Design a protein around this ligand. Structure first.
Ligand SMILES: CC(C)(COP(=O)(O)OP(=O)(O)OC[C@H]1O[C@@H](n2cnc3c(N)ncnc32)[C@H](O)[C@@H]1OP(=O)(O)O)[C@@H](O)C(=O)NCCC(=O)NCCS
Ligand SMILES: CC(C)(COP(=O)(O)OP(=O)(O)OC[C@H]1O[C@@H](n2cnc3c(N)ncnc32)[C@H](O)[C@@H]1OP(=O)(O)O)[C@@H](O)C(=O)NCCC(=O)NCCS
Lengths: 304, 248, 248, 304
């Protein structure tokens, strides 16, 4: 028998009553949200690095300004998510340290290097596109602070995602060299973007509880499938291809059927052994350590 | 027309080059709030650069903000030597920012009274932003200068290391003077009182010392830069140089 | 011919990119003797790059060492990820140098037995230089590792930080394998015993620990680099990109 | 009356007997040579910086290799000069510290920035050209170790100076853009090169004693005049101009008459207030300070 507290919670979830920071919640519910919201927040922070990598090299002042505005918004979104995470009783400073130590994760996609300007447009278009599918799908997540932060974040990010697509469109309509740059960026970011949605529904340890508690409203595979269906026509608009020999439209189901993901790569990456994991963590560790005297200065001054 | 073009271009280059430096900070700041603030300031400055550069291209009757930013070399760039200084530590970045912001506030305040309407209008937008920048930079000057012993030392060193380049803030050449006599430009020499009133007070409030070294470094305006600018432009212009004449 | 060209180009790019890094040290070293040594090593490596690149251009039937060095982008460059690592502190530079020198000595020793005479001849010159480089890099490994507590810590950290990139030293792809079966190239997998005999002994003699992390980073050979290479090429190629097709 | 020691010295100088490290010498002779040889050595070290500035950016692999070989030789020359300086009883480490502290000088010319590739060819051609005139003129300096080091150094540097001229010739024969680059470099380095020879003969405090003791064998103005006479035909060969409205050939004397030097600039520069003085000293100070643990490592290891 569930306790009366446990039972009341289940009923609140079933009736779509948003959980608020003062409500009782299962301890595993609290902890999985600290895990998920915190790592969502980590992801905003770490994702500034692959894009920041090209801020000084962007080809026009307009594209440079757009990228700066975007990265500025990402910092803001990190802040919203830490706020939301803290309503559950965690401390921003503690979970950030766990990210630095490798005890918490951030999105797999940020372990991939930006090797050309096209990579920046492709992150804006494909990567934020994938983030957006997942994030709009969390606008009805059961925990109120998370839901409300998703709404705020989605309003802002969808604009930047459109700008990313336009930057890709310029390449797609430009010179042969620009077209080739775009294709190569797509070839390198396509599968990593599909991996943002998580492991298969057969291999997802958090999904059982998350679905039951309406933290997750759609399965990893369900969201990934929507992303593929929505994005293939966008690839087509650019006159580009998808690096997937198995990709085809299946009229009998109304979906694009797509090839198998490299789950060995996926597992390597989330476990710190992808292309840029060490560099990403080194950069944030260096920023934290070198910034120490500045933070200590701020604290000392506020007291006087 | 050539004098006006060169003057406008100096103001744009100042903003362009400082924006570049700020861009390097992205993701590397002591706190997320600071990452945000620096990206914000750099974006403001870049917008200002786009405004001035666009006007300069209109004045010249050819090119645009991108031909100007990406197809000129270091002998044509006309930015202050101060804005090309490396970021160094956070105090070095704050000292450079504070010196520039105080100058921008003093400059744009008066340049919005320009007899050139476009310069007046560009300055009217820029001043509102420069005021935000000065609050941030002065705020950090005070926090670091009057924080810990360690931060107080770093802030003093940062101020000392940059001081020689402040001379150029008040340097007037024949372009400055001729345009100022027409009520178009601000004679930079007449900015010193307001810049010193602000900066001297800020340094003192931060519990620091005004450097005694007489500032002596100029040349940026004439395309005579430190060895810092060349490597900046190499990085900034690479793609445009590889793939010139394209749309992005 | 394409396999041979790509293999030769990998060896040249290795030397070219490491030479670039060493060039950054000029005038910045802990001692004048070290400034001299690094300029010397960088010049040797650059000469080797010129030899391999020149051969690659001859093999392809077009271009030369300059078209290759200055008109390829980061997705075409085929250097080891190890040689593009930043200089960092002196221990970081020494760790990178020592790993490469041990590899060059093992490689060039065997590549001078190539069935390709030009590769054999280039390697016969390069080996004599690589031996000098290894004495210098191993010498400093020992001095820093078995110097002070502080230098011993830095040397360990330097080794640890670079280790993941050593996997690529022994990576074989179809180009390696096909050419190795023809007696032309060295199968990099067969270099491990000699590289480990040298490096394991050197680390131990320096009173340090062989890192336990399994090395896992590759891709340089396929034009899949770290984010370090792009900014390197921006700097390296700027002038050629601005003023292409000229004589210097 | 001179002492017998003092008198014997004067006689040795008059008969062109080279002074060796064990011979008696006037204390002011010893000290002025420590001053001159040491600052000559400082100059080799500091001069690596304006040229090193372009090592990573040199336009071809050949010109890059030549520049590396050159800068390597400069480090070697610094070492020869410190050796020579130490035969007089000074310590390399002590005089180097005085350079770092601004208590000793290095050549004025190294306070000028390299703003283009042409500046590198012009330093190789004009600047080393001026160094060579002065240095060959010191091959008969009265102190043996200095004389012998000048001989060794001149053999090596003259080769590099020829390479500098050839790099300039390529620009001179190249595109309009390359020609303009060369001219601009000349416009910026011409007068600074003339200043390498020292102040006027009317304004040179060391000259009286230096000439008497045959340390200096030709006056500053005499060497500067030879440099101008030798170099103008070289400028002409390149199809370039000299930024000197007063420059003209005077048939009545057989010399080029040239305009007045900016002595105010000259004085600013040697007193630390030129274009790159602060940066040059900061770079060498940073290298010394950051290298401390390395030097201390070397010393600790040698003992075991
Ligand atoms: C990723 C997500 C869609 C589903 O994962 P989940 O139900 O929490 O976890 P799963 O059981 O499916 O996956 C197994 C493990 O891999 C992690 N994981 C899954 N996909 C990942 C990815 N793309 N990157 C990094 N880690 C990932 C999970 O977090 C979990 O590890 P954990 O228990 O230590 O946190 C979910 O965490 C989510 O929607 N998060 C918020 C979105 C976000 O982080 N966006 C960043 C882009 S800006
Ligand atoms: C410079 C030189 C030609 C003549 O100068 P001098 O007789 O020693 O000194 P002077 O009385 O003429 O000049 C007055 C002062 O200006 C200095 N000076 C003159 N020319 C200078 C220059 N180009 N750069 C820096 N300092 C200079 C002198 O060293 C002296 O200062 P000091 O007494 O503190 O050393 C002489 O020092 C010399 O030949 N030196 C060796 C060459 C050298 O240093 N070459 C470097 C290029 S690689």
């Amino acid at each position: 028998m569930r306790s009366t507290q446990e039972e009341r919670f289940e009923q609140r979830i079933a009736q779509e009553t948003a959980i608020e920071p003062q409500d009782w919640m299962p301890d595993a519910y609290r902890k999985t949200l600290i895990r998920q919201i915190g790592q969502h927040a980590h992801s905003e922070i770490v994702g500034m690095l692959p894009e920041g990598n090209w801020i000084t090299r962007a080809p026009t002042l307009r594209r440079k300004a757009i990228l700066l505005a975007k990265v500025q918004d990402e910092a803001g979104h990190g802040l919203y998510l830490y706020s939301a995470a803290e309503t559950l009783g965690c401390a921003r400073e503690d979970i950030y340290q766990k990210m630095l130590d490798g005890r918490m994760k951030y999105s797999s996609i940020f372990n991939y290097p930006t090797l050309s300007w096209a990579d920046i447009g492709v992150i804006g278009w494909l990567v934020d596109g994938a983030a957006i599918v997942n994030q709009v799908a969390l606008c009805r997540t059961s925990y109120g602070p998370y839901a409300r932060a998703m709404v705020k974040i989605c309003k802002e990010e969808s604009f930047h995602q459109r700008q990313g697509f336009e930057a890709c469109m310029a390449l797609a309509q430009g010179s042969e060299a620009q077209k080739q740059m775009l294709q190569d960026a797509i070839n390198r970011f396509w599968w990593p973007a599909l991996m943002m949605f998580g492991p298969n529904d057969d291999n997802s340890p958090n999904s059982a509880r998350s679905l039951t508690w309406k933290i997750k409203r759609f399965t990893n595979d369900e969201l990934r499938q929507r992303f593929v269906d929505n994005t293939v026509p966008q690839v087509e608009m650019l006159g580009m291809t998808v690096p997937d020999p198995d990709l085809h439209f299946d009229t009998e189901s109304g979906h694009y059927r797509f090839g198998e993901i490299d789950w060995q790569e996926f597992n390597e990456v989330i476990n710190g052994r992808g292309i840029c994991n060490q560099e990403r963590l080194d950069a944030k560790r260096k920023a934290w350590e070198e910034g120490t005297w500045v933070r200590e200065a701020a604290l000392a001054h506020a007291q006087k | 027309s050539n004098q006006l073009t060169a003057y406008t271009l100096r103001l744009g280059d100042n903003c362009l080059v400082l924006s570049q430096r700020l861009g390097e900070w992205c993701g590397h700041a002591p706190e997320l709030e600071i990452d945000l603030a620096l990206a914000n300031i750099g974006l403001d400055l870049l917008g200002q650069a786009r405004n001035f550069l666009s006007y300069a291209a209109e004045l010249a009757g050819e090119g645009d903000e991108d031909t100007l930013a990406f197809t000129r070399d270091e002998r044509q760039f006309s930015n202050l030597l101060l804005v090309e200084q490396p970021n160094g530590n956070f105090a070095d970045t704050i000292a450079r920012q504070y010196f520039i912001d105080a100058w921008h506030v003093a400059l744009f305040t008066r340049l919005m009274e320009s007899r050139d309407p476009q310069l007046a209008a560009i300055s009217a937008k820029a001043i509102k932003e420069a005021r935000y920048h000065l609050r941030f930079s002065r705020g950090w000057l005070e926090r670091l200068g009057n924080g810990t012993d360690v931060s107080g030392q770093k802030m003093q060193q940062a101020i000392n290391k940059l001081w020689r380049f402040t001379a150029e803030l008040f340097d007037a050449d024949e372009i400055d003077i001729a345009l100022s006599e027409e009520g178009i430009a601000v004679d930079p020499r007449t900015l010193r009182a307001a810049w010193e009133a602000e900066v001297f007070a800020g340094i003192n409030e931060a519990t620091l010392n005004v450097p005694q070294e007489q500032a002596y470094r100029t040349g940026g305006k004439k395309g005579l830069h430190t060895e810092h600018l060349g490597p900046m432009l190499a990085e900034m212009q690479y793609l445009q140089r590889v793939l010139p004449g394209q749309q992005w």
